[PDB]
Amino acid sequence: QNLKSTDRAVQQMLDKAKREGIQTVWDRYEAMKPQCGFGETGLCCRHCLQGPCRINPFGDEPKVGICGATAEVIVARGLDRSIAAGAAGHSGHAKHLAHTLKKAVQGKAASYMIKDRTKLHSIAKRLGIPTEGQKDEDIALEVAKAALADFHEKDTPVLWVTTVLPPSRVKVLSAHGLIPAGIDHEIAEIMHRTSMGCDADAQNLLLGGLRCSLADLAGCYMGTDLADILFGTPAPVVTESNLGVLKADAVNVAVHGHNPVLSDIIVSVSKEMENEARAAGATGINVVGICCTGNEVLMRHGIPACTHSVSQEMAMITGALDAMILDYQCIQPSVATIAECTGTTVITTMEMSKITGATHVNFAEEAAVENAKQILRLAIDTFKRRKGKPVEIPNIKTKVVAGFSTEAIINALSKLNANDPLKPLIDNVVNGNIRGVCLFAGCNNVKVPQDQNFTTIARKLLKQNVLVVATGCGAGALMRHGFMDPANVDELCGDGLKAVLTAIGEANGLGGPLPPVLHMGSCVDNSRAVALVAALANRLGVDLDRLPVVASAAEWMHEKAVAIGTWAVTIGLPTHIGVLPPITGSLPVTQILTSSVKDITGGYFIHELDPETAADKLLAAINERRAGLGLPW
Amino acid sequence: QNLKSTDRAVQQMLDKAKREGIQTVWDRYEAMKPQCGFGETGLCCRHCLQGPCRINPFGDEPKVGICGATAEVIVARGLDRSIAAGAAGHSGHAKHLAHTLKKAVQGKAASYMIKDRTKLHSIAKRLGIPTEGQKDEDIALEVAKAALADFHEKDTPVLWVTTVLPPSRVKVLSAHGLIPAGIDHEIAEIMHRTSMGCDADAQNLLLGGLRCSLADLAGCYMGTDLADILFGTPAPVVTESNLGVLKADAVNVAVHGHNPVLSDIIVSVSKEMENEARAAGATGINVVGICCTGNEVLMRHGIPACTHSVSQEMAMITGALDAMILDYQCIQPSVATIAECTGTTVITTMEMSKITGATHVNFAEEAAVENAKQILRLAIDTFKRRKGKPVEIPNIKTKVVAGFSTEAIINALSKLNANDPLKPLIDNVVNGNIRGVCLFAGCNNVKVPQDQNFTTIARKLLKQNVLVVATGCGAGALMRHGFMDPANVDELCGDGLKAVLTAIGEANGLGGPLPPVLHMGSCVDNSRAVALVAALANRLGVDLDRLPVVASAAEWMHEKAVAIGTWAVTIGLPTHIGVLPPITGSLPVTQILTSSVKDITGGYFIHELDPETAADKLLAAINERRAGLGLPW
Ligand code: SF4
Ligand code: SF4
Ligand code: FES
Ligand code: FES
Numbered sequence A, B: 001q002n003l004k005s006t007d008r009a010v011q012q013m014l015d016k017a018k019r020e021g022i023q024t025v026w027d028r029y030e031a032m033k034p035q036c037g038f039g040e041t042g043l044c045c046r047h048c049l050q051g052p053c054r055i056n057p058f059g060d061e062p063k064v065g066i067c068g069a070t071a072e073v074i075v076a077r078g079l080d081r082s083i084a085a086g087a088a089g090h091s092g093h094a095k096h097l098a099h100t101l102k103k104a105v106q107g108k109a110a111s112y113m114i115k116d117r118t119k120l121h122s123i124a125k126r127l128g129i130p131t132e133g134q135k136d137e138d139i140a141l142e143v144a145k146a147a148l149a150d151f152h153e154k155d156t157p158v159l160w161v162t163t164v165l166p167p168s169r170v171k172v173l174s175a176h177g178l179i180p181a182g183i184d185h186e187i188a189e190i191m192h193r194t195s196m197g198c199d200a201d202a203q204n205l206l207l208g209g210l211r212c213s214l215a216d217l218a219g220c221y222m223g224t225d226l227a228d229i230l231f232g233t234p235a236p237v238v239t240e241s242n243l244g245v246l247k248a249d250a251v252n253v254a255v256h257g258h259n260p261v262l263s264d265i266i267v268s269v270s271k272e273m274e275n276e277a278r279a280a281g282a283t284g285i286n287v288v289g290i291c292c293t294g295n296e297v298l299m300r301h302g303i304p305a306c307t308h309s310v311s312q313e314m315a316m317i318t319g320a321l322d323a324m325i326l327d328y329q330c331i332q333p334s335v336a337t338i339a340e341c342t343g344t345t346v347i348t349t350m351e352m353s354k355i356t357g358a359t360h361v362n363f364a365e366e367a368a369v370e371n372a373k374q375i376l377r378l379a380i381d382t383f384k385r386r387k388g389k390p391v392e393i394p395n396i397k398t399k400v401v402a403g404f405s406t407e408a409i410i411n412a413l414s415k416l417n418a419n420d421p422l423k424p425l426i427d428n429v430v431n432g433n434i435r436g437v438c439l440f441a442g443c444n445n446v447k448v449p450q451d452q453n454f455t456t457i458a459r460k461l462l463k464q465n466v467l468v469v470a471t472g473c474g475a476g477a478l479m480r481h482g483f484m485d486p487a488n489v490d491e492l493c494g495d496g497l498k499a500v501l502t503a504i505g506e507a508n509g510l511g512g513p514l515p516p517v518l519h520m521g522s523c524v525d526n527s528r529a530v531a532l533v534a535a536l537a538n539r540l541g542v543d544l545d546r547l548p549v550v551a552s553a554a555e556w557m558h559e560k561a562v563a564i565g566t567w568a569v570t571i572g573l574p575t576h577i578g579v580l581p582p583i584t585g586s587l588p589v590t591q592i593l594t595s596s597v598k599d600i601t602g603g604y605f606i607h608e609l610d611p612e613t614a615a616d617k618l619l620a621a622i623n624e625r626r627a628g629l630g631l632p633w
């Protein structure tokens, strides 16, 4: 099983699934091999009913699509549509939160409210919305209206791009025509230009993709902003992760998906029905997190994280998962069929994300609390049904310190320098105690033994004094392997980084260091990392493509992750990816994405499947940035 | 060559291309066979980087996608993305026209203006925009603003759906949750729900697709509305079609693509530079049309149509095409490479639709006339270069009567009944002189010998007294085979239909009939057919799914055509399609689209590759509708 996952709890459930005959994501992957080489290389097009068209990577015909589309065009069109789909996911998420905030402050959804007034006012100031003499609900109404207006064309560009990046970066992007005009406008324009008989120039197509990736960045940043207003900005929290957080004696309820508009309510309501859970023979309701919805409630409430991404089915294989409450994105639809064998109640809640065989509960913000009680009562029933059955919960979990929003990081640094909090961090970059910053982001992918790239790369970077931050299932991988436990700082961290994490931790009255890796939240919360390094850029008076900052989507899978990697490149970052996207069938497209885009944005993709090589390449990228600043390395 | 095209002019150029070694769309199709059966059946998914995934239509593994996506889900997600891409094309077109109208009436683009004041005022009344006491430019500004607002969520649904369909139809659709909230909103939501780990229920997915197809209908109707305001509502015109409209002695300039915002200017400006063309040794500038941009200027100005769709490369093979002026959609990118051998100057004009190897001229409405003169001067140069070369223009063309906008059809009928113009048409449906109405729409497709399905089906329907209307390349196929020449009414039409076309034509002072087939315009002008049959429904007091009206996308290709076919079904029409979309790999999805969707919308797809069988099935559908009205048949 260690060829499938490096997580020992996942390995134990893989053994249980095998002897019980339950097919897993790894079994379905094995049944897919050999995968189609045209699709893997990107040399396949189905954009019209004259297709499907394919191009042989090498050899004889077919050499060109039926309409005349070249390899370069077919590859760039497919990539562009992946970016648009990712942008559609992150901005559907943000749009939902914008409608929720509007409903809350219009008196139409009383379970939601302005919880972070300070964040509301700073966002309003950032957008140019007046606050002086204005009532909070009216400021919030204007912020929500501004968020919805960024989805379409108007007299301004997308403000959740132009107001969140360094001004010099906005100017570079504007010069190349890369600033999005509207989030859904850009998504639709990608879909149009990539349809048959439209854009057929690789460079033109890819420039469109870069602009659409910034529409995705806007949706991410808007989602984080709105979630913080509604549910609170995260601050440091202590909790646990991996399958051992399940409790045989409790009603185990997983929140799974991305949008915490309902799961945040699930968390608060579950506390109230403790006695009702006790009446059925449970110690209580044990809410646990899967994927990014789990990250959201981990960051804000310390809800323990059960598992992530590729291994999500193994939480049900324990026999102890009474309910899985789903919203949307990254949910393997296999969970609906596996539920028949494991007894889990799988519940969908969102109109546009249903799974055949799962029970649906039509969540509405107006009725959020009643929905949560109906959902939780289905879980309590399910706990009752497994009275006196054996469950196999692996006795495996790690300690997780998390909650490092950008505000929290700045506050932590402010204990070393009250009026200039970023300066202690920059001081330690300059003197070499911090070599640079690496963001780990994105998914697991069944093609890669689960977590192997994240942990192998993180171990090498930490030894070399890199400050490592992480989001989404990159944070999930690192948390499940102990990288968010401060007890492991001595083992994992170079002496310079250890010195800095210790100094910051001791100044925050901890008696010990910050954890080896800083958990910055969910996938939309990659926007928090942007806010941090944008602040660092603005304090140094340089653009992002001069900072020693890199990103690694080390095991990425989802179209959302392709969007994120692409806007990481667009805002100027060297961006490692650990699974090749379908681009190798066009050398000109590969060359743009790995080399010549540097001349446009200063960022670039680093394609490297071998994680030890990837770490060396990321260190090289960091050290080159150090040299360009005249720093030793 | 008659296995490739039924058009004799196309056959002659196919012979020329063969002996000159110029590869054609048919050669590239042959080089693609056998095409991939997973793609052809729809059992392939590339929506995440764990793919590509495929499912064997029959036999052993793989049976399911790696994430657990079933055949039903994979097929429905792929179809939904095709619909969204089509909606993105038609509404990108309409959005461009909305910005052009706004610029024109703000004094920023003086080459554009309100040409159809009556249409402006009727659209404003339809939208609920006040006209009394308002200045035309202010009414137009409000109409343009309303058009742009339909792209995003707001306090009303998409008005270019809810105000253009019969009220009973809007109620049926609203009950099923099918009314779009915003055009680009629906496109983005499709892209989101079809991304990995999201919607995984075939019925839910397909309902989303139906709603997105109505977003496409809105873009079509908005595009026709705005084009008529800016350039004039079409009225009956006489012109010619096929390659023989090229003139060896003239500067032959093709306008090609879909959006006539520039080609309409090309038409008017070309008239002015006649003397400048004469100075270079031409008789003049001969503007000819390809594809829907050609249809637009054929409908409004009688510009002759050169060719269409699959055969577009053969216009250049003549050696006499001096320029091809491109905007976007349905342009084979092969034209840019074929130009090197034929001497044609291929010119792109739209920022998001470039072709490597083609010259680009950045069209802007503000500078429309100067751009046209620069473009036309490139064509005049090219004419000069082919001084004293042999060209091979097939001496083959047909006469084309066209310009049957819905307003023109109603006006024609008004000569038989001034105060109740639809009544003479309904009178003749009831008494059997008109069996029913069939709309031919959509593309040619290299899989089908060019025009064979359109003409075979049209011949059988006309003999059976069906009133036949046509748009896009369906109109192109029928026009190139003589179906828009009133001299062929005796040969083609049953006695009842002949009687009606003659009576209408004689009442319009023609001395002869309307043509056998009524050309209703471009692909967005399928919206005109909707306006006609919606008017008929409202005059009869029934919904569209009770009228003897059907549609045939007999040789369809483009994602735009998939969108159109889907909204034809959604508004209640039996809709024949002549090339299978990638759905046969899921029997449940095929059953929804061909049968059970009847229970939702009253419309349904008729899958029939054999055109004689297709005609029999369309007649059966018409006659069933007749029976449901209690009419003889
Ligand atoms: S768009 Fe071109 S390459 Fe793609 S399926 Fe159609 S003919 Fe083939
Ligand atoms: S979304 Fe599912 S079926 Fe599609 S490529 Fe990814 S794992 Fe395969
Ligand atoms: S030929 Fe396999 S992905 Fe299309
Ligand atoms: S396997 Fe051929 S279309 Fe994907």
Ligand SMILES: [Fe+3]
Pocket (backbone or CB within 6 Å): A291, A292, A308, A309, A330, A443, A472, A473
């Ligand atoms: Fe995840």
Ligand SMILES: [Fe+3]
Pocket (backbone or CB within 6 Å): B291, B292, B308, B309, B330, B443, B472, B473
């Ligand atoms: Fe066409």
